[PDB]
Amino acid sequence: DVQLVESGGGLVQPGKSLRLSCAASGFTFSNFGMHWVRQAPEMGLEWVAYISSGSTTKYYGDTVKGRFTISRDNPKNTLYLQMNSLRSEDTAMYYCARRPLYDGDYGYPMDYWGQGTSVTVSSASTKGPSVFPLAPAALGCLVKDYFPEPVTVSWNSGALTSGVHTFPAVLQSSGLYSLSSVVTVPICNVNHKPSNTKVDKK
Amino acid sequence: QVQLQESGGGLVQAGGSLRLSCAASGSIFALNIMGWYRQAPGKQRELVAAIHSGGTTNYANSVKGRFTISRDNAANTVYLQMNSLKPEDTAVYYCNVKDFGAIVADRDYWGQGTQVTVSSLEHH
Amino acid sequence: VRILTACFLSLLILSTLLGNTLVCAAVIRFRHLRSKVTNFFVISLAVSDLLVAVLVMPWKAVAEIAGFWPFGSFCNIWVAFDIMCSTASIWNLCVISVDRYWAISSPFRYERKMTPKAAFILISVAWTLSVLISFIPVQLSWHKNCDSSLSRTYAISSSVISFYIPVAIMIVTYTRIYRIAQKQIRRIAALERAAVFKRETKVLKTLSVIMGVFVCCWLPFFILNCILPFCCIDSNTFDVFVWFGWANSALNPIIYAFNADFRKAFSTLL
Amino acid sequence: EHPDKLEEKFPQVAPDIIFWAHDRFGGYAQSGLLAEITPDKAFQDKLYPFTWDAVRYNGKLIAYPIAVEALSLIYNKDLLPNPPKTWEEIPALDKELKLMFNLQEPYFTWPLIAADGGYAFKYENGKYDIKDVGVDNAGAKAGLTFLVDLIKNKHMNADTDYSIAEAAFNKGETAMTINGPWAWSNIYGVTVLPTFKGQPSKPFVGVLSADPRIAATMENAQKGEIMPNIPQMSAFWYAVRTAVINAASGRQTVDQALAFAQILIMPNLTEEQRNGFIQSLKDDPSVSKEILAEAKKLNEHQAPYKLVINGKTLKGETTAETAEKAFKQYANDNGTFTVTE
Amino acid sequence: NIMLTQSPSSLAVSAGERVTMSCKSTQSILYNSNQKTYLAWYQQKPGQSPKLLIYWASTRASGVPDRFTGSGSGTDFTLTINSVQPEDLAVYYCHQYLSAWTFGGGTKLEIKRTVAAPSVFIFPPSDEQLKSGTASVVCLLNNFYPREANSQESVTEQDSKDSTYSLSSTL
Ligand SMILES: Cc1cc(Oc2nccc3occc23)ccc1-c1c(C)ncc2nccn12
């Protein structure tokens, strides 16, 4: 089946540049055009850029034209988005999506979407997550002291799925974020890519 | 009063051409400027082209060369030829007539504009 | 006969104040009338006229009614304000004419060069010149019942700086505008006669109603102001002729602020 | 047989053997109308090499050259003893008696246009540059404006053709004309074309493929250039032709004619876009430069340190004193450098 | 750059109840060459990418349940679900792909159910947290259907398996 995986997202300061990449597998990437679309709570889905099959025509949004540049390497089936003069408004989750062939005759819009990569534009410095275990039946783990949003937690390395609750992070008074992962049983691992941390909570 | 009736708007494929027209019925002073502005949903109205009675023409830096403005010297009918239309060109195109009848001021006549849409679909 | 003159002066002052207030309200209330840069001068004129109807006309009216000048130690500042307002109004008319000329001759360059900053700088220069030509000579006793006439040198200098140079500028401006209008109208007429005056008549009628009125209002006052110092004429005729210069302040907005836009504003406001 | 408009009848029909200038054969080879005949060394050795180079296309021989032909100024000794050497001197001599050639075909008038430096499909680095069309340069502009001025000054008719020019020259009416070797059999003296603004006239050399006069012909040829063998020629000439029809007859100005020519040259532009650009150029010649720039632009578009913790409860990894103190602070806040507990 | 609007911002309906949502376009998106309308609907679940449900506003995509039905024309379109399933708890986005691509605001759909009482738990601060100086207790309320139950709170998104929220509060 079609597979699209994005990468390159992380922490960047205002004004710097970032090169997001996307790998495609399972289809003739050379034949299909690509779209970069960003989503954020304050603006929702918003088409960012589009590149054609042969890179002949390239389209950009009304607010991103000139600052962002889309490109593609077909000999290796890869898509690239260079973002320059990044601003606070550019923080969002970016997804790549293929364009079905000849939509004017078949009408199939962008069908397959990737996993998406988060990009945060802020001057705040990166910080590693601090875990605190809370035992009681149910046990929890409170993760704090982390500014970047891209954090995840998994209990027993994904041994069980039912009975887990990961509360969304909220803006702490100190400008950082904090979340809580609680499991109701009848030792978790936290990963933070912006800081490259993988910590076992217990 | 001066009535501006526009026509020629419609749906066109990217890269195509379209000839919009606007006829002005009414007494207009010899010194007058006929122009075309464009307004997009959410954005502001910006100038596209303009032409003075003397024959001088003016275009924006973003549409210079792609769009051409002309006028019938005998009928005051203004034509706008658009070529190599791009998706971002979809907007309501308003014809504006600035009349300098009163030398101490100027009166603006509008024609409610006409919709123009550029498609980005692919075929074959 | 004095009661009739007093009533006429009061009616003129009230009409001037009402016109200025209506213009200022129509300007500051709506936003479509303030978008144009040229309007920044129109109000700048109205404001000036307002001062004439406040700090110039009422004092002289009450003085003529009383027959003398009761406001002791006040004639100097009064003459200062009078000269300031007169010079400001004349230079506002001049800059308005220059702006209309620049817009009619080269509208493409006008829309890009005549920014609000330029209009503000011009209004500044105008008011600063009016203040410098008015207060600096009066406070320093350079102009030397308050019936004393101005000195020859100062009278000539002020008349030249305030009236004659703006007069020549407006003359050349309106002449070039009329020539451009004639050229275009005659091109249209030639095209018509080749395919198969009233426009030039209207243009000339408007230019007359403007320039001839401004002249009949202000010119004789300055002619007398230049003649009397070198003298011959009674003060009654001088006052009768200078009252026209102040009535011009009220007549101005009737011509410069009475177009379709101002008409619609006054209709939708009241 | 020799049907009229043979160059225009051959494509729609495709005769067994066709004799015509090589500039057309190229186009015939683009669609596959001419058969790839295998030549032999015996025929190549007996013929000149420059003719083979001219008829060469894509490294393969199409047909066998026949003869080389170039335009020359044919003047009658009975009218003038010496022929003019400069074009600027032609308008004078004329008004002293009262030049006339084919104004319909663009091949006879192209030398005048290219005299001042007009060129098309510049041959650089051993190859033709299709995108580089310099028919709107100052040289072609000067040539075409001089041509239209001579036409307006009552020197050459706007409807004359080869037949009328020949009938007038044979009858002794015209003083001189511009004709090639094909006119010698029917018809004096022949010389090189006059110079224009100091530069020599650059006429095209027509090599057909399946003495003082020859000297003048070879001089005119070497002073010129051989026609390109690219398929686009069939269009180029047509465009030029239109310009002439739009320039000699006085239907439009020189700038408009050159703009129409440039637009017609571009093959990638569709019919709708072509008509749109034509209309935009008609109603507004002031911005013709930007229109041509945008057309050329669109032409190329449609072209086919690290920390490791091993505590009893908190274990893992995360990311030199400046970094060591930061790592220590991080470890304290949580409760290759490795730390154990 | 055509703009789309979705009147229903956030609404909640019971399981199996027929729900409908409207969409308003600023101009017609009808294509003359094929006479088809170029509008589509995407479904984005919490923590997942959008999924194409209906395209052309009349044709349903492969693998999509039949309960989803798209109708309308011109500038007014409608998406109806005859029997909303608990797994259908996601965000619905309108998309136009005739002119430059643009997306709407989105319609948040929630599933109503019976009032389930919350399971309450309390966790004092551990020694590791008190070492740094933090002594904030953690209160947790699981399976609370009503969303409303120096302190900060955090609520989980409505799960697609039980439709009950969960709240956490810290000092
Ligand atoms: C005669 C005069 C002339 C003045 O100069 C100007 N006045 C108006 C406009 C001007 O523009 C440029 C100079 C200038 C100022 C004041 C007076 C005056 C005085 C001194 N006393 C009594 C009186 N009654 C009516 C007028 N006056």
CB atoms within 10 A of CB A6: 22
Q: How many CA atoms lie within 13 A of A9 on its CB side?
A: 24
CATH architecture of D71-201+231-301: 3-Layer(aba) Sandwich (3.40)
Kindly list the residues from chain B whose CB atom is less than 8 angstroms away from the CB atom of residue C174.
103
Cα(D212)–Cα(D227) distance, rounded to whole angstroms? 24
Q: Is the CB of C82 under 6 A from ligand 1?
A: yes
Interface of B with C in 5-44 (CB under 8 A): 29-31, 33
φ, ψ of residue D174 to 5 degrees: the values are -80, 150
B50 in Cβ contact with B69 (< 8 Å): yes
Q: Of the candidates B31, B50, B104, which has its C-beta nearest C256's C-beta?
A: B104
Cα(A105)–Cα(A118) distance, rounded to whole angstroms? 34
Interface touch E127/D313, C-beta < 8 Å: no
Shortest Cα distance, chain A CAs vs residue E82, angstroms = 24
User: What is residue A113's three-state secondary structure?
Assistant: strand
B7 within some domain: yes
* Structure-determination technique: cryo-EM
* Residues shown for chain D: 341
CB atoms within 10 A of CB A167: 23
Q: Is the CB of C158 under 6 A from ligand 1?
A: yes
* Residues shown for chain C: 270
**B48: containing domain:** 3-119
D210 in Cβ contact with D109 (< 8 Å): no
Interchain CB contacts (distance < 8 Å): B and D? 48
**Chain A contact for E160 (CB, 8 A cutoff):** no
Query: Per the structure block, which two tokens stand in for B1?
Result: 């009063």
Interface touch D291/B68, C-beta < 8 Å: yes
Domain C2-269 carries which CATH code? 1.20.1070.10
Domain E119-170 carries which CATH code? 2.60.40.10
Cα(A93)–Cα(A40) distance, rounded to whole angstroms? 6
> How remote is the CA of residue B39 from the centroid of ligand 1, in Å?
54
CA distances for E96 relative to A80, B116, C146, E21, E99, angstroms: 24, 16, 81, 16, 7
> How remote is the CA of residue B36 from the centroid of ligand 1, in Å?
51
Hey, which residues does A88 pair with through a beta bridge?
Answer: none
User: What is residue D292's three-state secondary structure?
Assistant: helix
**C161 Cα nearest atom in ligand 1:** 12
E127 in Cβ contact with E148 (< 8 Å): no
Query: Per the structure block, which two tokens stand in for B46?
Result: 């910006």
Kindly list the residues from chain E whose CB atom is less than 8 angstroms away from the CB atom of residue B43.
1
CB atoms within 10 A of CB A66: 9
Hey, which residues does A189 pair with through a beta bridge?
Answer: A154, A200
Among protein residues, the one with the nearest Cα to ligand 1's atom 5 is: C83
D245 in Cβ contact with B43 (< 8 Å): no
Do the domains spanning E4-112 and E119-170 agree at the CATH topology level?
A: yes
CB atoms within 10 A of CB D280: 30
Q: Please name the helix (run of DSSP H) or strand (run of DSSP E) that holds residue C42, with its range, or none.
A: helix C39-51
E contact test, residue of A134, A177, A201, A202 with most E CBs within 10 A: A134
Kindly list the residues from chain E whose CB atom is less than 8 angstroms away from the CB atom of residue D312.
none
> HEC profile for chain B?
CCEEEEECCCEEECCCCEEEEEEEECCCCCCEEEEEEEECCCCCCEEEEEEECCCCEEECCCCECCEEEEECCCCCCEEEEECCCCHHHCEEEEEEEEECCCCCCCEEEECCCEEEEEECCCCC
Interchain CB contacts (distance < 8 Å): B and C? 52
**Chain C contact for B61 (CB, 8 A cutoff):** no
User: What is residue A176's three-state secondary structure?
Assistant: coil
In chain C, where are the structural domains located?
Answer: 2-269
CATH number at residue B108: 2.60.40.10
* Residue that the structure tokens 């198969």 belong to: C196
Residues D289-301 as b or e (16 or more Cβ within 10 Å = b) = ebbbebbeebbee
CATH 3.40.50.720 fits E4-112, yes or no: no
Interface touch D315/A199, C-beta < 8 Å: yes
> How remote is the CA of residue C21 from the centroid of ligand 1, in Å?
25
Query: Per the structure block, which two tokens stand in for C249?
Result: 């302040």
Cα(E7)–Cα(E94) distance, rounded to whole angstroms? 12
Q: Of the candidates B87, B88, B121, which has its C-beta nearest A104's C-beta?
A: B121
Query: Per the structure block, which two tokens stand in for D14?
Result: 């495709």
User: What is residue A182's three-state secondary structure?
Assistant: strand
For ligand 1, pick from C64, C94, C152, C158 the residue to mutate: most ligand atoms within 8 Å of CB.
C158
Query: Per the structure block, which two tokens stand in for C105?
Result: 């001759």
- Residue E102, phi-psi category: left (phi > 0), alpha (psi -120 to 50), beta (remainder): beta
**Chain E contact for B11 (CB, 8 A cutoff):** yes
B18 within some domain: yes
Q: Please name the helix (run of DSSP H) or strand (run of DSSP E) that holds residue C167, with its range, or none.
A: helix C165-195
Interface touch B117/E38, C-beta < 8 Å: no
D313 to chain E: closest CA residue? E128
CB atoms within 10 A of CB C151: 15
Among protein residues, the one with the nearest Cα to ligand 1's atom 22 is: C147
Alpha helix stretches (DSSP H) within C67-151: 75-105, 107-113, 116-139
**C159 Cα nearest atom in ligand 1:** 12
**Structural domains for chain A:** 3-121 (2.60.40.10), 130-200 (2.60.40.10)
Query: Per the structure block, which two tokens stand in for E65?
Result: 């349940």
Shortest Cα distance, chain B CAs vs residue A108, angstroms = 11
Shortest Cα distance, chain D CAs vs residue B80, angstroms = 9
Q: Is the CB of C248 under 6 A from ligand 1?
A: no
> How remote is the CA of residue C97 from the centroid of ligand 1, in Å?
25
Chains C and E touch (3+ CB pairs under 8 A): no
E21 in Cβ contact with E69 (< 8 Å): no
User: Among candidates B55, B110, B105, B64, which has minimal Cα distance to B83?
Assistant: B64
Cα(C72)–Cα(C146) distance, rounded to whole angstroms? 9
Cα(E90)–Cα(C99) distance, rounded to whole angstroms? 61
In chain D, where are the structural domains located?
Answer: 71-201+231-301, 307-340
**C238 Cα nearest atom in ligand 1:** 25
Cα(E92)–Cα(E79) distance, rounded to whole angstroms? 9
Shortest Cα distance, chain B CAs vs residue A94, angstroms = 22
Entry resolution (Å)? 3.0
Count up the domains in chain B and report the number: 1
Residue C20 buriedness (CB in 10 A; 0-12 / 13-18 / 19+): buried
A62 to chain E: closest CA residue? E1
